[PDB]
Design a binder for this molecule. Structure first.
Ligand SMILES: [Mg+2]
Ligand SMILES: [Mg+2]
Ligand SMILES: [Mg+2]
Ligand SMILES: [Mg+2]
Ligand SMILES: [Mg+2]
Ligand SMILES: [Mg+2]
Ligand SMILES: [Mg+2]
Ligand SMILES: [Mg+2]
Ligand SMILES: [Mg+2]
Ligand SMILES: [Mg+2]
Ligand SMILES: [Mg+2]
Ligand SMILES: [Mg+2]
Ligand SMILES: [Mg+2]
Ligand SMILES: [Mg+2]
Ligand SMILES: [Mg+2]
Ligand SMILES: [Mg+2]
Ligand SMILES: [Mg+2]
Ligand SMILES: [Mg+2]
Ligand SMILES: [Mg+2]
Ligand SMILES: [Mg+2]
Ligand SMILES: [Mg+2]
Ligand SMILES: [Mg+2]
Ligand SMILES: [Mg+2]
Ligand SMILES: [Mg+2]
Ligand SMILES: [Mg+2]
Ligand SMILES: [Mg+2]
Ligand SMILES: [Mg+2]
Ligand SMILES: [Mg+2]
Ligand SMILES: [Mg+2]
Ligand SMILES: [Mg+2]
Ligand SMILES: [Mg+2]
Ligand SMILES: [Mg+2]
Ligand SMILES: [Mg+2]
Ligand SMILES: [Mg+2]
Ligand SMILES: [Mg+2]
Ligand SMILES: [Mg+2]
Ligand SMILES: [Mg+2]
Ligand SMILES: [Mg+2]
Ligand SMILES: [Mg+2]
Ligand SMILES: [Mg+2]
Ligand SMILES: [Mg+2]
Ligand SMILES: [Mg+2]
Ligand SMILES: [Mg+2]
Ligand SMILES: [Mg+2]
Ligand SMILES: [Mg+2]
Ligand SMILES: [Mg+2]
Ligand SMILES: [Mg+2]
Ligand SMILES: [Mg+2]
Ligand SMILES: [Mg+2]
Ligand SMILES: [Mg+2]
Ligand SMILES: [Mg+2]
Ligand SMILES: [Mg+2]
Ligand SMILES: [Mg+2]
Ligand SMILES: [Mg+2]
Ligand SMILES: [Mg+2]
Ligand SMILES: [Mg+2]
Ligand SMILES: [Mg+2]
Ligand SMILES: [Mg+2]
Ligand SMILES: [Mg+2]
Ligand SMILES: [Mg+2]
Ligand SMILES: [Mg+2]
Ligand SMILES: [Mg+2]
Ligand SMILES: [Mg+2]
Ligand SMILES: [Mg+2]
Ligand SMILES: [Mg+2]
Ligand SMILES: [Mg+2]
Ligand SMILES: [Mg+2]
Ligand SMILES: [Mg+2]
Ligand SMILES: [Mg+2]
Ligand SMILES: [Mg+2]
Ligand SMILES: [Mg+2]
Ligand SMILES: [Mg+2]
Ligand SMILES: [Mg+2]
Ligand SMILES: [Mg+2]
Ligand SMILES: [Mg+2]
Ligand SMILES: [Mg+2]
Ligand SMILES: [Mg+2]
Ligand SMILES: [Mg+2]
Ligand SMILES: [Mg+2]
Ligand SMILES: [Mg+2]
Ligand SMILES: [Mg+2]
Length: 90
RNA sequence: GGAGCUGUCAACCGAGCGUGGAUCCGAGGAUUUCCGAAUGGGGAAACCCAGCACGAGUGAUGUCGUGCUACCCGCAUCUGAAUAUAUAGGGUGCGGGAGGGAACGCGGGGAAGUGAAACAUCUCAGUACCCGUAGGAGGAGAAAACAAUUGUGAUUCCGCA
RNA sequence: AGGAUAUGUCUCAGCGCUACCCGGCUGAGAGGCAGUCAGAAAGUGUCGUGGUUAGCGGAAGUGGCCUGGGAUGGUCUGCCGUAGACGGUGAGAGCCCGGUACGCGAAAACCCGGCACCUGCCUAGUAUCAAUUCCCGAGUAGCAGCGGGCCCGUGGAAUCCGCUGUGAAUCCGCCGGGACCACCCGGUAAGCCUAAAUACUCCUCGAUGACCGAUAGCGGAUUAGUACCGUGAGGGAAUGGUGAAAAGUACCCCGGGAGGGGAGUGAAAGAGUACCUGAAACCGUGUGCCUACAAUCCGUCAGAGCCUCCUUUUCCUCUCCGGAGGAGGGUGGUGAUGGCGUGCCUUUUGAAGAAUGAGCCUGCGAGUCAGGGACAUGUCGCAAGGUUAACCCGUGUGGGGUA
RNA sequence: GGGAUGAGCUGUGGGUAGGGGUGAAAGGCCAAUCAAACUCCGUGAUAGCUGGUUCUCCCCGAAAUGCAUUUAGGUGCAGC
RNA sequence: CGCGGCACAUCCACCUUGUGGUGGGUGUGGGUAGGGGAGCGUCCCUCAUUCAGCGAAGCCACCGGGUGACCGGUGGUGGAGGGUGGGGGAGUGAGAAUGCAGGCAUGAGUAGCGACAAGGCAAGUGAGAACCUUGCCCGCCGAAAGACCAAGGGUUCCUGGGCCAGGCCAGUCCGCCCAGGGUGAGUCGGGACCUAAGGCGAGGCCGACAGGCGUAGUCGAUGGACAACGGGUUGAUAUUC
RNA sequence: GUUGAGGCGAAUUCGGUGAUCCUCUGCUGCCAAGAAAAGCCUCUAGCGAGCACACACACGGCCCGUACCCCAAACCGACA
């Protein structure tokens, strides 16, 4: 996916819309990501958060506003690189 | 190709790998037990027992590893039984076949039920089935042909008639 | 084929008994042609705007408000579009995601094509005349017998195929034109090869559906040719759905457990792994009415009495009440009692019948399709004309197409 | 109750296959079915016979006779 | 006959004076096989329009409606698709086929609980004991109901757990369920030795094809040949240790 | 003696009866006249310069089965 483990994201749909966090685990096969502070659930002992669908997040470009992800033609060294749209640089 | 991964039922774990590029996708190669046309011999398929050669191992028999060893046909060579010419046959070396596959092709063998308001000619039907044998298709195909007073000009397939 | 006039792709070495003309043959070199082909068979390099086998990029809303667990819904708005295909995402998404239009991409391998190497063929015969001779596919053709097959069932039965017998000729030959004969016309059997137009899909990609949606659709959405049955060849099932997310009920109580209650999660437990919705048969519990002196196809018409819920009167007038209660009127439930009344289907002259069939519920289960078929009709277009079939061209349902 | 040293009983291995086998003979037996086994295929065999054939209302409304028939419980034509 | 509603036909006049409507007379309206005419309901497609997480479908109840098939409104349940109109197409309607599949009744808490050897008490275990464990009595078999094999079966054997399925009752037990363990051969039974009946069968002979038979040979025990006895030991093997 | 394992451990003589077993693949009788091959011994063909034997020591002895039921609740009968 375009959302990686260390990325910081913003929630664009669901109960926790508008919250900010960073990914903790990516599940490319199921198209889910685990983000702290989002849909924390009260499991029974003897509270943690559950993964949300990757469609519900935007990767924050680390420059403020959320954005969609594109790629620039690198390599030139030595492979492809992930950058942003909406004034993209990465 | 680019950040996760160690397939699934099917989770639980355990232990690890990955930007020095994993997992994953494509291509080529290596490995590939035993049975099976099964083909060293045998056999109740997946088991048993060998021969030869070269290696390994043992104090030496035992034991292990790798190759080759069916039958038939064709070709090439050596030999020429009863028997003389010779042939049958035999030895050696090269090639080849065998079996499988859903349908379609070609050649050959070929029912009955049913219909005939009974039934044998007839039909069903050259169908079902069987045998042989292919190819990506096959079969046919280049006039010992049609036509009829004019002419057409190898074959195949479609529509008419 | 063989004879007489009639000549040397280009050259060279040899040879054809010797000196000569004309040669001819072999080998080599020189040129032209063809080539993976039916007409000859392989291989070797190199090059592809070539193709196949992985793939990559790819525009545009974190918009406001309302409802909601959740917006992809409604309403205001902003934008992209060579992209408004499809699918997912917590409910109907072109702008959230995979993607789509469109455009890039191949080490290597394979397929295809090109160019060379390579292979092989061509190395004088052209015409004229002669009409004397030779050749033109043999146990074949023809003929006879018995059969098969042709529209043709043996018929006057040609043409084609098989077995048996007999058995020709080489152009003045032989065969065919539906018995046969004469003439005429056509053709040249008994040797071989040959692309395309045609048939099919185990399989691999990409699409589609006025097709099915879990008793359907494949036997097979589930362990499926499995379980199971048969000695065997064979036969051959049944079983899908929590929730958006396991957040799958911590803890306490009764209980050996099973199970439950309280808490808790969840929008919902009126989703608790026996789980979406949750019908009927069938089985309970509570309750209103009726029923133990009566002979009942079980209903129907007449009909008292109870029970219940609403209203019009006169009464509690406490009345803002509300209505107890009284009467009346009407709903609905039940039905003491009176009359009438022989279940359904099929098959029959005729059945309540002691003729057939049915224990009950739910689901499934029978006049369909094809054809320029045949007859008759309704309707529509054109009209002394109407209409195309195959086929061709188009993204289609459109345009051509006169047989 | 019969035989129980015999034309005996029995174990193991083998052979005969469907118009065929085998039968001291009953049409007996051939995998609980035999006057021609079983399985798959022709095949959705055929049946003048039996059964079944699903929503509604409006108008009209029969026949069980004649002739023929390998015909009589079928069908063709007539009649209605 | 009286009064009211419906329908078909015909007649009489109007409206487009027959595509059909308006009003009024008269006749007619039982019905099997069968013929004609017109409709209801379910599903799918197309065009237009409209409703829907502020709750579609489906189901259930109530209140109403139409000449019939049937329809509408309201509420409840439920959680994603419907309504109407002009057309098009059907796997379009079941109560019967000793129909098929699933579920469930009646018989009914009924018959039966599988030999005529026979059980009892004490103690124990446990939530639970006629059936399980221990002890002691009693009874039965003893040419088997004892002890070994072969064929067949396949883990049923041992130990430790289990108790909702199974055992014709219950079960703490089990040939049931779960995990782990367990089978030791120069001499035993077989092969590596041998052959019978019979099978296959190089060449071969026969047969249109398919194939039939058969020589050399090679398989094939139920038979021939061939070397072990006694004792001990494990929870489970023993002529094997 | 945790009733598992432990430790010790006597006498063992002479008769009777008596086989479906052994001598006996023998013996007798009978007619219905009663497998094969390997194995073993022997003959030579043949091979043959090294042999055959005794003792002692040290070694090699392969593959499959082996649990359990087995007139049964474990096999064939759909069933304990
Ligand atoms: Mg790989
Ligand atoms: Mg072999
Ligand atoms: Mg063999
Ligand atoms: Mg000679
Ligand atoms: Mg083949
Ligand atoms: Mg016939
Ligand atoms: Mg007939
Ligand atoms: Mg008939
Ligand atoms: Mg081929
Ligand atoms: Mg060909
Ligand atoms: Mg991409
Ligand atoms: Mg809200
Ligand atoms: Mg959606
Ligand atoms: Mg879409
Ligand atoms: Mg989303
Ligand atoms: Mg010729
Ligand atoms: Mg002839
Ligand atoms: Mg004929
Ligand atoms: Mg003829
Ligand atoms: Mg002849
Ligand atoms: Mg003629
Ligand atoms: Mg040819
Ligand atoms: Mg062709
Ligand atoms: Mg099915
Ligand atoms: Mg369903
Ligand atoms: Mg079986
Ligand atoms: Mg809650
Ligand atoms: Mg709900
Ligand atoms: Mg629910
Ligand atoms: Mg249920
Ligand atoms: Mg439910
Ligand atoms: Mg009374
Ligand atoms: Mg009476
Ligand atoms: Mg009454
Ligand atoms: Mg009466
Ligand atoms: Mg009668
Ligand atoms: Mg009756
Ligand atoms: Mg009765
Ligand atoms: Mg009667
Ligand atoms: Mg009858
Ligand atoms: Mg009767
Ligand atoms: Mg009955
Ligand atoms: Mg039609
Ligand atoms: Mg017409
Ligand atoms: Mg006697
Ligand atoms: Mg006796
Ligand atoms: Mg046998
Ligand atoms: Mg038969
Ligand atoms: Mg008799
Ligand atoms: Mg029998
Ligand atoms: Mg017969
Ligand atoms: Mg047929
Ligand atoms: Mg009438
Ligand atoms: Mg009347
Ligand atoms: Mg009527
Ligand atoms: Mg009728
Ligand atoms: Mg809601
Ligand atoms: Mg629907
Ligand atoms: Mg509703
Ligand atoms: Mg509807
Ligand atoms: Mg419509
Ligand atoms: Mg139907
Ligand atoms: Mg029904
Ligand atoms: Mg029924
Ligand atoms: Mg009774
Ligand atoms: Mg009783
Ligand atoms: Mg008993
Ligand atoms: Mg007690
Ligand atoms: Mg046991
Ligand atoms: Mg129990
Ligand atoms: Mg019990
Ligand atoms: Mg043979
Ligand atoms: Mg042979
Ligand atoms: Mg033999
Ligand atoms: Mg043997
Ligand atoms: Mg034996
Ligand atoms: Mg034991
Ligand atoms: Mg043992
Ligand atoms: Mg044992
Ligand atoms: Mg045994
Ligand atoms: Mg049994």
């Amino acid at each position: 996916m375009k959302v990686h483990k260390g990325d910081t994201v913003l929630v664009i749909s669901g109960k926790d819309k508008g919250a900010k966090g960073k990914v903790l685990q990516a599940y490319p096969d199921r198209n889910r990501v685990l983000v702290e502070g989002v849909n924390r659930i009260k499991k029974h002992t003897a509270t943690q958060e559950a993964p949300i669908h990757v469609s519900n997040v935007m990767v924050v470009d680390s420059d403020g506003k959320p954005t969609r992800i594109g790629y620039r033609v690198d390599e030139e060294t030595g492979k492809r690189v992930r950058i942003s749209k909406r004034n993209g640089k990465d």
